[PDB]
Every structure is written in structure tokens, then in C-alpha cells.
Amino acid sequence: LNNIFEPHVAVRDAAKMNIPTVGIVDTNCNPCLITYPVPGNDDSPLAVHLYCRLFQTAITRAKEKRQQVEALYRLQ
RNA sequence: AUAUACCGCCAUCUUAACCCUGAUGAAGGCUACAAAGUACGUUAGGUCAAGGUGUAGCCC
Ligand SMILES: [Mg+2]
Ligand SMILES: [Mg+2]
């Protein structure tokens, strides 16, 4: 949601550009066009910190796994 | 006599695209503590005095 409590324009624009979206949706949000919605609280700092931690950890772990797999492929 | 013959000189006037919204109707698009907006000719002109090339007139 933007600051007028309407959807972020990027949701519709990403749908137009065929870019998948992950999103945190609160009870007053519209999840119809988010590809992978995650229902949850987006206001409490604890919750937002948990989301940031999870996504950062997943991204770094995936990138490290890619590096390890390519290294194994070349070495072996 | 004619630049109301040209040339010279002066002067007069004339000389987009993309992206969104509305049911992809006519149509519309701003808020900063930010909400779709971003990129030459012309003249019955003057000048025959610091300049020219022609054309015509009269020639009891
Ligand atoms: Mg909320
Ligand atoms: Mg004249």
C-alpha cells in the first residue's frame, strides 16, 4: 500500500510487465495480483524485521549454494 | 525619358515521441510526510551626386 492506503502502482505495473511479485499483505490489502502473497502484519517493526531477515537469509543462502554448485561442477 | 529597364545601395512587409487512466467512448494525466507521468521572397518604393549594362525618344 502507498501512503494514501491504495495499492502501490508497482503491483499493477509488474503484472503488466509479467514480473512475478512476492508481497506481504495485511487484512486491508488486496492480494489478487500478487503472485506469492504472504498474509501477515506489515506495521509492527518486529514483523518487518523478521521478514527482512528471512528474505536476506534466503537470498544469500541461494547465491552461496549457486557458487558451491558451480565450483563442484568445475572441479569434478 | 526609363532603376514604372536591369545590377549596386537604402528602405517596406511576409516567412514530437513514449507510458498510464476512463470497460482501450467523446476524453484525461496533479498532491514533495508526493497518489502516472517522463522525455528567401515582396514593392506601379527611393536613389543616375561620389557606381555601372541596356533600352527607347526628337533629328525643318
Ligand atoms: Mg498494515
Ligand atoms: Mg521605382
Coordinates of C-alpha atoms (C1' of nucleotides) and ligand atoms in Angstrom, one line a residue:
Chain A
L1 CA 0.0 0.0 0.0
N2 CA 1.1 3.6 -0.7
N3 CA 0.6 6.4 1.8
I4 CA -3.0 7.1 0.7
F5 CA -3.9 3.5 1.6
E6 CA -4.3 2.5 -2.0
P7 CA -2.2 -0.2 -3.8
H8 CA 1.3 0.5 -4.8
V9 CA 1.3 1.3 -8.5
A10 CA 4.1 -1.2 -9.0
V11 CA 1.8 -4.1 -8.3
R12 CA -0.3 -3.4 -11.4
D13 CA 2.8 -2.4 -13.4
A14 CA 4.7 -5.6 -12.6
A15 CA 1.6 -7.5 -13.5
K16 CA 1.6 -5.7 -16.9
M17 CA 5.3 -6.4 -17.4
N18 CA 4.9 -10.1 -16.5
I19 CA 7.2 -9.9 -13.5
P20 CA 6.3 -12.2 -10.6
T21 CA 5.7 -10.5 -7.3
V22 CA 6.1 -11.6 -3.7
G23 CA 4.2 -9.5 -1.2
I24 CA 3.3 -9.0 2.5
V25 CA -0.5 -8.4 2.6
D26 CA -2.3 -7.1 5.7
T27 CA -6.0 -7.5 6.3
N28 CA -6.7 -4.3 4.4
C29 CA -4.6 -5.1 1.4
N30 CA -5.6 -6.5 -2.0
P31 CA -3.7 -9.8 -2.7
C32 CA -5.3 -10.6 -6.1
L33 CA -2.4 -9.6 -8.3
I34 CA 0.5 -10.6 -6.1
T35 CA 1.9 -13.9 -7.4
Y36 CA 3.1 -15.2 -4.0
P37 CA 1.2 -13.3 -1.3
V38 CA 2.2 -13.8 2.4
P39 CA -0.6 -12.8 4.8
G40 CA 0.8 -11.1 7.8
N41 CA 1.3 -7.9 9.8
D42 CA 3.3 -5.2 7.9
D43 CA 3.2 -2.5 10.6
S44 CA 5.0 -3.8 13.7
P45 CA 8.8 -3.3 13.5
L46 CA 9.3 -6.8 14.9
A47 CA 7.4 -8.4 11.9
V48 CA 9.1 -6.2 9.3
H49 CA 12.5 -7.1 10.8
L50 CA 11.6 -10.8 10.7
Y51 CA 10.6 -10.5 7.0
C52 CA 13.8 -8.7 6.1
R53 CA 15.9 -11.2 7.9
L54 CA 14.2 -14.1 6.2
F55 CA 14.4 -12.8 2.7
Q56 CA 18.0 -11.7 3.1
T57 CA 19.0 -15.1 4.5
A58 CA 17.2 -16.9 1.7
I59 CA 18.9 -14.8 -1.0
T60 CA 22.4 -15.1 0.4
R61 CA 22.0 -18.8 1.0
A62 CA 20.8 -19.4 -2.5
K63 CA 23.7 -17.4 -4.0
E64 CA 26.2 -19.3 -1.9
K65 CA 24.6 -22.6 -3.0
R66 CA 24.9 -21.5 -6.6
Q67 CA 28.6 -20.7 -6.1
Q68 CA 29.3 -24.0 -4.4
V69 CA 27.4 -26.0 -7.1
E70 CA 29.3 -24.3 -9.9
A71 CA 32.6 -24.9 -8.1
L72 CA 31.8 -28.6 -7.6
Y73 CA 30.8 -28.8 -11.3
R74 CA 34.1 -27.4 -12.5
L75 CA 36.3 -29.2 -10.0
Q76 CA 34.7 -32.6 -10.5
Chain B
rA1 C1' 12.8 59.7 -70.7
rU2 C1' 13.1 54.7 -68.4
rA3 C1' 16.2 51.8 -61.9
rU4 C1' 7.2 52.0 -63.9
rA5 C1' 14.7 48.8 -67.9
rC6 C1' 18.1 45.6 -65.2
rC7 C1' 22.7 45.1 -61.3
rG8 C1' 24.7 48.2 -56.8
rC9 C1' 22.9 50.8 -52.3
rC10 C1' 19.0 52.0 -49.0
rA11 C1' 14.2 51.3 -47.2
rU12 C1' 8.5 48.4 -46.7
rC13 C1' 6.3 43.9 -45.5
rU14 C1' 5.8 38.2 -45.1
rU15 C1' 8.4 33.7 -43.5
rA16 C1' 7.1 15.5 -31.5
rA17 C1' 7.6 10.7 -29.0
rC18 C1' 6.7 7.3 -25.3
rC19 C1' 3.9 5.5 -21.0
rC20 C1' -0.6 5.1 -18.0
rU21 C1' -6.3 6.2 -16.7
rG22 C1' -11.6 6.3 -18.4
rA23 C1' -15.0 -1.1 -19.6
rU24 C1' -8.5 0.6 -25.0
rG25 C1' -16.4 6.4 -25.8
rA26 C1' -16.0 11.7 -26.9
rA27 C1' -11.6 12.2 -23.5
rG28 C1' -7.9 12.8 -19.3
rG29 C1' -2.8 12.5 -16.6
rC30 C1' -1.5 16.9 -10.2
rU31 C1' -0.6 16.3 -4.5
rA32 C1' 7.1 16.6 -2.1
rC33 C1' 5.5 13.3 5.1
rA34 C1' 4.2 13.1 -3.0
rA35 C1' -1.1 9.4 -5.2
rA36 C1' 1.3 8.3 -13.6
rG37 C1' 3.8 10.8 -15.7
rU38 C1' 8.5 11.1 -18.4
rA39 C1' 11.1 12.8 -22.5
rC40 C1' 14.4 33.9 -49.0
rG41 C1' 10.5 36.2 -51.5
rU42 C1' 7.8 41.3 -51.8
rU43 C1' 7.3 46.7 -53.7
rA44 C1' 3.5 50.9 -60.3
rG45 C1' 9.2 52.0 -53.2
rG46 C1' 13.6 55.9 -53.1
rU47 C1' 18.4 56.7 -55.0
rC48 C1' 21.6 58.4 -62.1
rA49 C1' 25.6 63.4 -56.6
rA50 C1' 30.9 60.4 -55.1
rG51 C1' 28.6 53.3 -59.2
rG52 C1' 27.7 50.6 -63.5
rU53 C1' 24.9 47.4 -68.5
rG54 C1' 20.9 48.3 -71.7
rU55 C1' 16.5 50.3 -73.8
rA56 C1' 13.7 53.7 -76.2
rG57 C1' 12.5 59.5 -77.9
rC58 C1' 13.2 64.3 -81.4
rC59 C1' 16.8 64.6 -85.6
rC60 C1' 12.9 71.7 -90.9
Ligands
MG1 MG -0.8 -2.8 7.8
MG2 MG 11.0 52.9 -58.8

